[PDB]
């Protein structure tokens, strides 16, 4: 009965598939659709950090420039969770 | 076949009810 | 949204670090750690599947051939999330 | 190498801190 982890990986699915579902059934996000996910999930509205988001987009696009696949988007969230610093300390 | 996905497909059969609710919540926030 | 994702990536670390840090400050899961993590935190569908859980553990250790590291464990959870393909088709 | 962790730090420092709350819950609730 895997509910606690299955619903957390289900959060990442339910976030990701909104943005591909804007054009079709696909398991990928194109570089500008990936940037839409970042701005619509992490609502930094009117802040100067969009210049950091175009570099975060270049870190995500380093997996594939044309469109970033769901598994590599989760590999990147694995780096994001590791770089959180305090999370792996308590 | 690839072999990998056929071992992972056994974990789908666990029978959870919350994952399919949480995906809907993560979609419904953007209605 | 941000807080819904930030708690979900916190579920993966809230599960993982109890096993990796069980006998030190360590940030990797050995073959016993990953099996104890699944059987405690996720349990199972049926105890007859435990022979496929040790094969899933061997497919997790496929990345390093001794003990599996945090980003590779999350990358494999991206493949496990891809097995729920209907949620990634909509 | 690229300055990955220095750009990803700008997201750590923007997150709502439920990461560390959920970790501490998961560390207590399993007993």
Swiss-Prot record, chains A, C:
The modification N6-acetyllysine is found at residues 40, 47. It is a peripheral membrane protein. The modification N6-succinyllysine is found at residue 47. Ca(2+) 2 binds at residues 61, 63, 65, 67, 72. The modification Phosphoserine is found at residue 46. GO terms for cellular component: cytoplasmic side of plasma membrane; cytosol; extracellular space; nuclear envelope; perinuclear region of cytoplasm. InterPro entries: EF-hand-dom_pair, EF_Hand_1_Ca_BS, EF_hand_dom, S-100A6, S100/CaBP7/8-like_CS, S100_Ca-bd_sub. GO terms for molecular function: calcium ion binding; calcium-dependent protein binding; S100 protein binding. Residues 12-47, 48-83 form the EF-hand domain. Keywords: Acetylation, Calcium, Cell membrane, Cytoplasm, Membrane, Metal-binding, Nucleus, Phosphoprotein, Repeat. This is Protein S100-A6. Ca(2+) 1 binds at residues 28, 33. May function as calcium sensor and modulator, contributing to cellular calcium signaling. May function by interacting with other proteins, such as TPR-containing proteins, and indirectly play a role in many physiological processes such as the reorganization of the actin cytoskeleton and in cell motility. Binds 2 calcium ions. Calcium binding is cooperative. It holds the Pfam family S_100. It comes from Oryctolagus cuniculus. Its main location: nucleus. It is found in: Nucleus envelope; Cytoplasm; Cell membrane. PROSITE patterns: EF_HAND_1 (PS00018), EF_HAND_2 (PS50222), S100_CABP (PS00303).
From Swiss-Prot, chains B, D:
May be involved in calcium-dependent ubiquitination and subsequent proteasomal degradation of target proteins. Probably serves as a molecular bridge in ubiquitin E3 complexes. Participates in the ubiquitin-mediated degradation of beta-catenin (CTNNB1). Monomer or homodimer. Component of some large E3 complex at least composed of UBE2D1, SIAH1, CACYBP/SIP, SKP1, APC and TBL1X. Interacts directly with SIAH1, SIAH2 and SKP1. Interacts with proteins of the S100 family S100A1, S100A6, S100B, S100P and S100A12 in a calcium-dependent manner. Phosphorylated on serine residues. Phosphorylated upon induction by RA or at high calcium concentrations. It comes from Mus musculus (Mouse). It is found in: Nucleus; Cytoplasm. This is Calcyclin-binding protein. Highly expressed in brain and EAT cells. Expressed at low level in heart, muscle, and at very low level in the liver, spleen, lung, kidney and stomach.
């Amino acid at each position: 009965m895997a509910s606690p982890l299955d619903q957390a990986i289900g959060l990442l699915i339910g976030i990701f598939h909104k943005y591909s579902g804007k054009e079709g059934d696909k398991h990928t996000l194109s570089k500008k659709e990936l940037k839409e996910l970042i701005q619509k999930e992490l609502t930094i509205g009117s802040k100067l950090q969009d210049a950091e988001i175009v570099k975060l987009m270049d870190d995500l696009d380093r997996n594939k420039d044309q469109e970033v696949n769901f598994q590599e988007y989760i590999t990147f969230l694995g780096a994001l969770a590791m770089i959180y610093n305090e999370a792996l300390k308590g | 076949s690839e072999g990998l996905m056929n071992v992972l497909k056994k974990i789908y059969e666990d029978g959870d009810d919350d994952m399919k609710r949480t995906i809907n919540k993560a979609w419904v926030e953007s209605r």
